[PDB]
Ligand binder design. Structure first.
Ligand SMILES: NC(=O)c1cc2cc(OCc3cccc(C(=O)O)c3)ccc2[nH]1
Length: 228
């Protein structure tokens, strides 16, 4: 997260760290007792490498009573995801067992009605992604409040030049933004998950290149299908 602040420890009990070989790789969001939603490009070239999900965390390195590392039974990328596109960039991770729920570990309600979030709505994005251009990685969860940007402005030639489909949404990226390592994490509006940070390479904190998030409401039937 660029231009954000350290999050209040355990105030976002749905926040997951998707890990590869014991290091943070991507964000994720607990959407059911046994399921974490993240981004499909996080899984790219990770074959053989061990994927785990850390729940109940604030610090990535320090012991916390609520922290628990879960192994992954199944990793299910969206079938239409492709390495060279930002489309259908979702991944469902089935934990090895149902997560132990409590005040620091709880699934987040997610949007099932396929209607756009209104432009200007203030949404929250959290993650352990880089915090500066040098690539500094924070030990503790960071977050930033970002206003939703209307799709037509986001699609302008100077911005994302038509790449923003009805299945995607944008948020302002003026000095405050998601970045590398935040991919897969949640965009929460009014206490409901609305988007998942995309995982394609993009500049961070440049107002001319808004943040891109996959609209979960646009994938409600796929999420249901995988869990069933
Ligand atoms: N969600 C975002 O805003 C955002 C994602 C993102 C990803 C970025 O490169 C991640 C990457 C991809 C492939 C290989 C490596 C490697 O390890 O060599 C690293 C850079 C800026 C970024 N911004």
């Amino acid at each position: 997260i660029l231009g954000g602040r350290e999050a209040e420890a355990h105030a976002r009990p749905y926040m997951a760290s998707v890990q590869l070989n014991g290091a943070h790789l991507c964000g994720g969001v607990l959407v059911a007792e046994q399921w974490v939603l993240s981004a499909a490009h996080c899984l790219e070239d990770a074959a053989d490498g061990k994927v785990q999900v850390l729940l109940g965390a604030h610090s990535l390195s320090q012991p916390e009573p609520s922290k628990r590392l879960y192994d992954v039974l199944r990793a299910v990328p969206h079938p239409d995801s492709q390495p060279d596109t930002i489309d259908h960039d979702l991944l469902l991770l089935q934990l090895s067992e149902k997560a132990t729920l409590g005040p620091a570990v709880r699934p987040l309600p997610w949007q099932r009605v396929d209607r756009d979030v209104a432009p200007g709505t203030l949404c929250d994005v959290a993650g352990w992604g880089i915090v500066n251009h040098a690539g500094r990685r924070p030990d503790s969860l960071q977050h930033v409040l970002l206003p939703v940007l209307d799709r037509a402005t986001c699609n302008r030639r100077t911005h994302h030049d038509g790449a923003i489909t009805e299945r995607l949404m944008c948020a302002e990226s003026n000095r405050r933004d998601s970045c590398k390592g935040d991919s897969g994490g949640p965009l929460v509006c009014g206490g409901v998950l609305e988007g998942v940070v995309t995982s394609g390479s993009r500049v961070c904190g440049n107002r001319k290149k808004p943040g891109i998030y996959t609209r979960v409401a646009s994938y409600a039937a796929w999420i249901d299908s995988v869990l069933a």
